[PDB]
Amino acid sequence: MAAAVRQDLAQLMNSSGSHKDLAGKYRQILEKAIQLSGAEQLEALKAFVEAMVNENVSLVISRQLLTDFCTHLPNLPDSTAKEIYHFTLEKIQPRVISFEEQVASIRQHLASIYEKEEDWRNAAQVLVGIPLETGQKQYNVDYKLETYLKIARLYLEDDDPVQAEAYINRASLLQNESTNEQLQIHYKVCYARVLDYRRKFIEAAQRYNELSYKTIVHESERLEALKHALHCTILASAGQQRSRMLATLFKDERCQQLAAYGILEKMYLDRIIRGNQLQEFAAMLMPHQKATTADGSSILDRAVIEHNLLSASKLYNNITFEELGALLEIPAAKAEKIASQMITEGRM
Amino acid sequence: KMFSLKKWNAVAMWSWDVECDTCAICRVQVMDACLRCQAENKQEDCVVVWGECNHSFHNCCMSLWVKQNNRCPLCQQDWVVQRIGK
Amino acid sequence: KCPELLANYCDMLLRKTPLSKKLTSEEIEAKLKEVLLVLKYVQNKDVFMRYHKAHLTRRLILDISADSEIEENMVEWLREVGMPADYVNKLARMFQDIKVSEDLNQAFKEMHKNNKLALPADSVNIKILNAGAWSRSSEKVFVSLPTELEDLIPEVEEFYKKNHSGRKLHWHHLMSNGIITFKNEVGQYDLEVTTFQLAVLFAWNQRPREKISFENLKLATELPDAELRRTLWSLVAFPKLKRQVLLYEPQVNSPKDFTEGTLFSVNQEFSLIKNAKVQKRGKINLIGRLQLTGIVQLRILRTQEAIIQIMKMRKKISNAQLQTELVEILKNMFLPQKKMIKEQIEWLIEHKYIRRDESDINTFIYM
Amino acid sequence: KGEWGFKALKQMIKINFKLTNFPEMMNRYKQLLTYIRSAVTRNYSEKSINSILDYISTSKQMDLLQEFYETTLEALKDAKNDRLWFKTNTKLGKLYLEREEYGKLQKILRQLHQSCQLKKGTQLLEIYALEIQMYTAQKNNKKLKALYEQSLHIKSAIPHPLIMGVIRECGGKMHLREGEFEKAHTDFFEAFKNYDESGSPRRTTCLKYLVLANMLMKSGINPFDSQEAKPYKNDPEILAMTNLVSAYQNNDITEFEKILKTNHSNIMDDPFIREHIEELLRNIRTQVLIKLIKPYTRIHIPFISKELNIDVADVESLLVQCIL
Ligand SMILES: [Zn+2]
Ligand SMILES: [Zn+2]
Ligand SMILES: [Zn+2]
């Protein structure tokens, strides 16, 4: 076929004196191969990368031309872009310590194109490969924070909270020193989402409520944070902290816009909640909050059961097990277990 | 082998990958807050207590612990404050 | 006071740091003891301690110590003479790390002996020391190492990860040293150089002697700008040198600064000859003595009445409790250190404001 | 320069040694001993590199090594030959254990009497560690205990960080056997810390003993939180151990018993956990019982039996023991 590029590249390789026309002819070849009949451009670029990777070229113009080719790469359909990115990542692998700058940008571009295709697994693995601690280059704090938040978000969208928490713990180290307020807000949002995904509902609710008071955040995002805080507080376990949080949220004036104001007003006054006034609530619950507790009961109708039990403690002096299960939907048995669990922790 | 080196002596320095690990007493990340400062809404100092050994904790966490036992919670060594950072 | 100069005397006795070849017998060690007595009489021991630590780091990281038992006993002698415990602990950690590094290097040489790397397995030595005691800075600077050493760092990193997984190794290129071979016409003389000097010398190696400019050298070595100039000072202004290896400077000037766009070039026929007569098998060391690596009085008055406040609040307290309460109170002010609190502790006990319990060494009593 | 002189001399020495022909070499090295010593400070580098080149023939050439070390002892009496000589002790002795080399090794008795009745902390620690290893090989607990109490006095030494971690491990085992867990926990933590930096085989073995000591400490604080022990959390050898730690704290019964039953061939093998497992499976049950009967005023014994997965008689015995 039309594989004549390799011979002329090899012939130019053994040149005696340093020159710049090689970059110009590379640009000419690439631009004339952009509009090509088939995949000959991909083969030409692969041969170019293979010939360029070899150490025989001095590392004073190799880096500049490599990053120029990397920056010119995205102006190309992603089908060949993914393949060429994988090829160059594999070819740079044997010697990485020299080209520690282009690898980062290449992996960032690969992760971006993977994310644009709704693929939250491979992009995280690609972004992980960037050496941010064990590397000879010194990256700025903002770059590391942004990469960590990106990886945490990608892991969260893949329903893997453990990895998201592990990679947000590192970002928490650099949060306190970075001066970018937008980065701090993004880190706070990511941490709140991670806490929500770990079934720690009261802490996530408190964090969301605190974030809702930030003036920098735009109004719609503030309302979204308030709604998430309300949902987390409602889903939280009964106790004094939850009661205080409910009172604080009820004191807020802007809480009437949310569609769950009736449930908040009923739960604030220690009123028993039945299943009739909850069916529309479970419709708007996020799917990660609808998971069961491996006991046949979802998260919602365990917090609501604990709240009913706590509220019944104010309007009764002594109650039998059968009557306690009659108004709590427990047949006879687990009502006693729930009551005993709610005690020995100071809740009731 | 012209214009080339012959013998090389490399020197490298190792350090722990994760510096600030979770506080053992409270189990929540050390450089965020304690349990009560966030609830009472003064959780802006809440500063860590890196000790002589290398173990980090919360000041609020360790304040209750030191009263009973005056040794490091993990390695049971003498507890003296080496450097406090925030 | 003399301070650092006195430390220089120690550098002339405990090891052959540079011009310290004048060693006679073990009796000089006794003289060193007298120097220790001076350290007891004189004040401002922080500078002396820092100079001693720097000298020990320079001697150990280069393996130029005249004696080993004397160096080991120096820690005990300094502890007996009286010094901060942090310095003694750091010295002990450094000695332990140096001891472990020999075994690590032996294991690396014995295990990796089939891949052949680039150089022989008996010519590469690896010394991994803990960064919490043997170093204080944490800034990384690129050096653009040559292709020969580009295949040795990854192998060392892989071996360290396999043996001691859980720790990250950050290579320090400033403290590394090596020996290179030159071919400057009349005589091939070995030269001892660091990493930056090696990179600077090897930059002009891909095209004979030729001639290169300052901008080209900076773009090739990719050094940290001004620091690169300092490296040039090592290769253009070598003290007591008849003829430098890189005998160039273009517009004369001085190696300190004002390099501008000087065209430095290596001298192919440079007269680098030992004793100025036939450099058949000479050797030149170019590293030299490099060893590259709220006012106080108004601020110290803050904490003493804080300690006295903690004491007047409660009479009975332990050391750990006192530290916890002190650091609990002083968070709004500056973050306390360890040395300041200790200094205040014996300043308080020496003024007899508090009583040290006899049964318990840590329990304190108010007055 | 005589340094390169005897460097070339030992070079030929080894060139001829590859062609065996020993008596000439030995006698040449013997007559060059004093000249090399006086001319240049020999100490470690050259003699130790010769020993490195020579230990590759540890099989056979035993008589040659023995006579080499004899002449090094009786000729290099000047200066300190001891520090590498305990290395010869570890090489020859503890290879056949109870051989009379153990009885002979006590020729350091003059230094022993000079120190005890100091400032030679390193040598004392090394010899104490060697004797501890030998007496552990022979399983003499009283001698190990006496050695540990005698070694506890030294607090002004700078040892290699493997010698210290052996006597610390011995002290931890002694404390565990005697019954003092408080010191056993810290002793095993110190032993693991010293093994981590230098060592290999007995590295993921002191961690397991440390975990067991912490679990015999009435719970409190997960050992897998310090920076030294976290990297080995996912190690296959220690996965059962960290699962046991996670089960013990946050009291539960089914997970603990399931972990104990599944890893029968990985936990219940050594004679150290197979004996102390009876103290466990009883502290966790006691904690569960205390946590369960808190909000009750009149409870049924069979209910406790169902909760604790034991029969009525064991529940009654446990209740009687707890009340008494
Ligand atoms: Zn804490
Ligand atoms: Zn706090
Ligand atoms: Zn500690």
Tab-separated table of C-alpha atoms and ligand atoms in Angstrom, chain B residues 33-34 36-37 46 60, ligand 2:
chain	number	residue	atom	x	y	z
B	33	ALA	CA	-13.691	18.732	61.599
B	34	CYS	CA	-14.721	16.857	64.710
B	36	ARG	CA	-19.327	18.582	67.688
B	37	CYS	CA	-17.732	21.614	66.005
B	46	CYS	CA	-10.612	22.388	64.680
B	60	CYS	CA	-11.331	18.017	70.466
E	2	ZN	ZN	-13.643	20.265	66.805
